[model samples]
Structures are given as structure tokens and as C-alpha cells.
Target: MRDAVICEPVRTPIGRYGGMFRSLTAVDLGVTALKGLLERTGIAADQVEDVILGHCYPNSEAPAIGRVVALDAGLPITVPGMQVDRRCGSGLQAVIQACLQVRSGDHDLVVAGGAESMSNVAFYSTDMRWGGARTGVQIHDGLARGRTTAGGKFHPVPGGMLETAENLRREYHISRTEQDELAVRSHQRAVAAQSEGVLAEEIIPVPVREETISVDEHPRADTTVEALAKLKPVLLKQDPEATVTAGNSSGQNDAASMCIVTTPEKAAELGLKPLVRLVSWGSAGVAPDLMGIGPVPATEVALAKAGLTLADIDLIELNEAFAAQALAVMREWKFGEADHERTNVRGSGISLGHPVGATGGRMLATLARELHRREARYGLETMCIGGGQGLAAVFERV
Candidate 1:
């Protein structure tokens, strides 16, 4: 198989829900990153063969968001586009698909990533009028109701994201204090990275109505473990022993991230400096209720497929979906504090915010930059998906 090299991984500054980017559409955010990738790499728009974007929430306004983003980015009509949805794994999955395309000789050049606008998610309703004048009631809470209605059953019991985090805390014997400490560290690291301008390169300034939003909108520099401890548990509100809190969980956010990739031969022909070469990728499924442990099997499969092991990977980007989840995965992998110092060095979704579909691509960009800064050879990007699945990708510095 031909090796695929990634170039110009870029993303917009992540905005808190209904915050800086509230007015911007998902397609607009995606277009900004897509255009920035081309501008940064000096790649002609016409040379790109396809655009694959991952989006979890499909607004009724723009169903085919990939095509909308492509056209909005000023790509020629000859270019085709595709949208992929794998829940939280959507973004990384898109990149993996692009690698497969390049390796299979289906295409030499492809643009792949993800975009999301959680703030713009529309409310849906199910009408039960039955051709009569208000004969039945309408359902307004579609998003919340759909969570418990999946798999052809109505589970009144809480079993979505927060519930899963609480379950992991109980199953792994992880304490709330430990989770709070990790959350504090996440914020501190993110603030430190911003102060040092380490994240400036991968982030593209987004121009809004009156000003340009340049920095991530989520990280709190003054956050402390004590403050996190004061917050109430969101999932198990009735139980005083609840562990999951808003402070320890990933925030709802809006953002877009993208990267241009091609075969090594094509990159050399274009005189482009390839940042990292895609080595291998793996995906695994676990029990939905135990979704937080998804990364364990994913990392094992990915390393095995790459003919490598955990020791061989110099750095790892494990998405911090929840502090409990992150802590559990690390403990299961037997990773000590020293290992975490090398992982999520710039903080992760906890402080930077996780815009679901865009987070995987964001991790890719962060991992690539971190590898170059450390002059490392191997890096791993992995994340837990919402539907009891996990995805992992192995990359080698060029």
C-alpha cells in the first residue's frame, strides 16, 4: 500500500456553546478551515479530487454539508464531496477513509476532516395529529428523547453520556477527587499552552461580524480543584455521591478542522513538506454502557496492526471526553503520571472543548504539531466514540 502523508492540518478556534461563533453556520466554519488549508499549503483548489467531512448533527438547513462547504470554500465544480457520520469518531474516521483511498490508488489527493455547530442544532418535533385538528400531542425534546429510544426500545433509565461516565467511575473505583484534580490540570495545561503560543500555528483566526476570534473560548486559567469540587454532579443529581460534574466533563462547542493528505509520491512531486505519514488505523466496539473503556481495545489493535507497541509510541492524543473516562482509560493501560505528561501536553477536549465531530481532527492537528516540536518519530491519536466504539490512528513523523 502507498503511504499517505498529511499536510496543513488546521482548525478554527473552538467556541463555547452560543458564544463567539454562535452566529456562524457549520458550513461557514468548515469553509474557513478548508480555505485556510489550501492557502497555507499553496495548493490549487482544482488539484483536489475529493472532500470528506464528518458531521454528527445534520441541521435541516444544510443536509449535504460537505458539498456546501466545498462550494463555499471556492473549490471548482469538478470536485466532489462526501459527508460521514460515526458519532464522536466521525472526524478521525474521515481521515482514515482518506488514507484508504490514497493507499488503494483511488485518488492521490484528498481533503478530509470534520465540522460541528452544537449551538445550531435544531429542535425537532414528532407530530401525531393523525389528520385531525390537534388530536394528539407533539414531541419537542427530540434530541434528549432519542438518546433513550435507540436500539428499538424506550429506556426510561439514564444511559447516555453522563450516565456512562458515572458507570466508569464506579466500575474503575475512580474517585471524584481524582477526576477533579485531572480537570484542574487540563485547564492549567491549556492556559499554559495558550500563554506560550503553542496552539497558534494549528488554529486559524475566524472573522466574525465585528471582530476576529483567535483564541479558544473554553479554557479557564483560574480553575482550581477546590472550585471543581464545589460544583454539583450533573448526572446523578439526586445521589449526593455523584461524581460527574460540569467542570469535569467536556463542554458543548462549535468548531471545524481539516487536513490535506496525499500519497508520499504525490507530496514529493508537489514539493510539499509532509508533516506525518499515516501508518495504520484501527476501530473496535465494546458494550455501550462501558463506552469509556473503548480506547483500550482500539489502541491494542492499532499498535498490533502497525507492528508496534505502547512503548514505541513517543506521544499519544487520547481525547478527554470526560475526566473520569480519561482517568479510567489511563489506569486500564497502566499509564502513570509521567505518561500523561507526554500525552495531552497542551490539554485536551476538557479545556479546549469538544465539538463532537470536529474533535478527532483537532487531535490529529495537535498530535502532528506536538510530534514536530518534540522531534519524535511515532504518535498515536485515539478517541472513544459515543456508540460503544473506539478509533485509533498511528502516524510517523516525516
Candidate 2:
């Protein structure tokens, strides 16, 4: 197989639901990021052969989201694109798909990543479409429905992701103190990164009506474990002893991430600096109720494929879907405090915002750039998927 490297990965600053990006569509964010990527890399719009974007909550508004993003971003009509979905891992999955095509020598340049505008998610209803009895029009928030649909008949997880976080907290014997502490660290690291401009290296300034917003809208610098403890968990009915709260768990977000994937030779020819080279990856499944631990097996498989162990990985980007989830996965890794320090140095889903489909690329954006800055040997980007699965990938700094 040919070598495929990711170049000029960039993402829009993530916004919380109803926050900075509320008025923008997912395609709008994608276009912003895609345009930023091309501009940063000095790549011509028409040079991109294919565009693959991950969008979990797709709707009629954007039938083929990647295509719409490319066209709207001023890519020639001749450029083609498609969409992919793997729940939380969709963004990273799209990048991996791009690598595969390039590695197979079938395509040279592909734009890959993910975008999500949870704020703009529609209020939908399936039963109302047929105009049934005039009882009531049952409405479902597209964001909330996405959580339930992942566990329809296959493995109905009652409280959706929040419940799954609770299960892992109980199963792993993770204390509220531990969870809260991790949450605090997530916020602190994110704040530090923000102050130090670590994240600015990858963020593409998004233009709002009046001004251009460049900083991430998440990451509360004032956050403390005591402050977090004061707020009760949002999913209270499911577990009275619930430890996961709005502060500790990742919630709906809005953002877009994009990167160029091509062979090392192509990257050099195009004068695009190769950020990292794709090594190997693994995707796995776990029980629905224990979904938080999904990354454990996924990373194990990924490490096995490369004949490397967790010890060999110089940096880790384990998406903090929930503080409990991140801690449980770390417990499985037997990670010590030092190990935790090497993980999510720029914060993760908890403090950074988990924009579902855009999460994978967001994680990658931090991981690949950090690896280069640190001169790290290997980096791991992994995330737990909804519906009992996870995806993990390994990268080597170029």
C-alpha cells in the first residue's frame, strides 16, 4: 500500500449549543473550515479530487453534505463528495477513508473530516408525515432523537449516553471526586491551551455577522471541582446517584474540521507539509450499556495491529465524551497520573465540546499538531461511538 499523510488539518472553533455558531448550518461551518484548509495549504479548489465529510444528523437541507460544503466553498462543480457516519467517530472515520483511497493509489488528494451544527438541528416527527389522527403532533429534537435512535431495537440503552456513563462509573468504581477532578483537569488544560495559543494553531476563525470569532466557545476557565459539584447531573431520573453532570459530560456542540489526505509524494509535490502519516487503525464493539468503555478494546486492537503497546504511544487523544468514561478507559489502561498528563493535553470533548460527527477530526487536530510540536514518535486518536462501538487510529509525526 502507498503511504498516505494528513496535511493542514484545521477546524472551526467549537461552539456550544445555542452559542456562537447557532445561526450557522453544519454546511456553513464545513465550508469555512474547508476554505481555511485550502487557503492555509495553498491548494487550488479544483485540485481536490474528492471530499468526504462525516455528518451524523444529516437532513434534507444538505442531501450530500460534503458536496454542498465543497460547492459552497467555491470548489468547482467538477469536484465530487460524499458523506460518512459512525456516530461520534464519523470525523476520524472520514479521514481514514481518505487514507485508504490514497493508499490504494486510486486517489491523490481528498478532503476529509466532519461538521456538525447541533444548534440548527431540526425538530422532526416521523408519524406526523402521514397525517394521522388529530391527537397531537409528536415532535422530536433531532439532537435528542439521534441519541435514542442509536439504540432502537438492537440494544436499547434506556437513558441514552448519560445512562451509559453512569454504568461505567458504577462498574469501574469511579468516584465522583475522581470524575470531577478529571473534569477540572480537562477545563484547566483547555484554558491553558487557549491562553498559550496551542489550539490557535489548528483553529480556523469563523465569521459571524458582526465579527470574526476565533476562540473556542467552550472551556470554562473559572471551573473548579467545587463549582462542578454544586450542579446536579442533568440525567437525574435514570440514576439518583448520578455523577455525570453538564459540567462533567460532553454535550451537543457545533463545529467543523477538515484536512487534506494524499500520498507523501503528492504532499511534497503540492508543497503541503505532511502533519502525520497514517499507520493503522481498529474499530470494535462493546455492550450498549457499557458503551463508555468502548475505546478499551478498540485501542487494544489498534495497538495489536501495529505490534505496539500503549507504552509506545507518545501522545493520546481519548475523546472525553464523559469524565467518567475517560477515567474508566484510563483505569483499564492502568494509566497513572503521568499517563493522564500525556493524554488530551489540550483538553478533550468534556472541556472542548464534543460536536458528534466533528469530534474525531477535532481530536486529530489537537493530536497531530501536538505530536509535531512535541516531536513525539507516535500518537493515538480514539473515540467511543454511540451504539456500542469505538474507533482508534495511530499516527506517526512526519
Best by lDDT: 2
* Candidate 1 lDDT tens digits, 44-72: 88888888899988866776777789998
Tens digits of lDDT, candidate 2, 188-255 = 99999999988889999999999999999988989988998898887777677888889889878999
Local error of candidate 2 at residue 261 (angstroms): 0.4
RMSD of model 1 against the true structure? 1.9
lDDT (0 to 1) per candidate: 0.86, 0.90
> Ten-residue segment with the worst summed lDDT in candidate 2?
143-152
lDDT of 2: 0.90
Model 1 regions more than 4 Å off:
128-159
